[PDB]
Amino acid sequence: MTYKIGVVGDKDSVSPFRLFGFDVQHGTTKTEIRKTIDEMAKNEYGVIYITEQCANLVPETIERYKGQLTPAIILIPSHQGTLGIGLEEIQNSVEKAVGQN
Amino acid sequence: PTRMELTRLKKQLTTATRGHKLLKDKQDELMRQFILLIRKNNELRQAIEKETQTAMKDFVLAKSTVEEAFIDELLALPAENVSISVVEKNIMSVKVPLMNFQYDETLNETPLEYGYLHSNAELDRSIDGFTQLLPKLLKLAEVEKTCQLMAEEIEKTRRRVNALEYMTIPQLEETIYYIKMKLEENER
């Protein structure tokens, strides 16, 4: 089954993904980013890579899709690094699985 | 309050109590598999955060010297047209994705080897950085999503195990007793 790849992040960091046929967008606000993610998920994107700085603004949107097969919303650093969110989220899935909250 | 109804309810009770024990076994197995996958999830994410950030930094440094209009033209010439195949795999009662890159197959005989016209070593090398991260980025996507879906399924399974144990089974047992005492008063 064949799916597109999206990327949401700052131009400096995510522009090279355009060379690979990834759909690269660059929102700065909660609203912009949320709308981008919903549009990708409406267009059957398999994966969305999203820089942590962008992801930091839309936790509610990201949590909505977490239980869905696609899209897989994957946080990545920017050239300035991470906010630690991807890592914390791995710990959150553990706490969910083992029933610790 | 009949013998026919008692019979039906008894099958439901043994199905529910056997099913409760086996659902707990399933909960345990999901957990075992989840824990292994979570280690991999962590391993992959640490590797990716490190290599991705390095690649991005190299690109930023590389592009800093060359004109913007040049970079814009370079980026508008595709190196590949990657899509992803996603197939559904069952891990017991949860569907999870198996992900694989699909590349342009008409270009098999001429595989990727990046060199842009009037570019430089540093700039091309930074593009090679991204090309190299691609398989591990897909790997992380598949492993992280699977862990996310498994966590959700284990929570669902845990809820059902408790509901069976503390609601369904005692309710069935109680009804079986009511049916029983009523039948046994009749013949006496």
Swiss-Prot record, chain A:
InterPro entries from the UniProt entry: ATPase_V1-cplx_f_g_su, ATPase_V1-cplx_fsu_bac/arc, ATPase_V1_fsu_sf
Transmembrane segments: none
Assigned keywords, A-Z: Ion transport, Sodium, Sodium transport, Transport
One biological process term in Gene Ontology: proton motive force-driven plasma membrane ATP synthesis
A GO term, aspect molecular function: proton-transporting ATPase activity, rotational mechanism
NCBIfam families: PRK01395.1 (NF002384)
Protein task: Involved in ATP-driven sodium extrusion.
Record-linked HAMAP family: ATP_synth_F_arch
Family classification: Belongs to the V-ATPase F subunit family.
Name of the protein in question: V-type sodium ATPase subunit G
Organism of origin: Enterococcus hirae (strain ATCC 9790 / DSM 20160 / JCM 8729 / LMG 6399 / NBRC 3181 / NCIMB 6459 / NCDO 1258 / NCTC 12367 / WDCM 00089 / R)
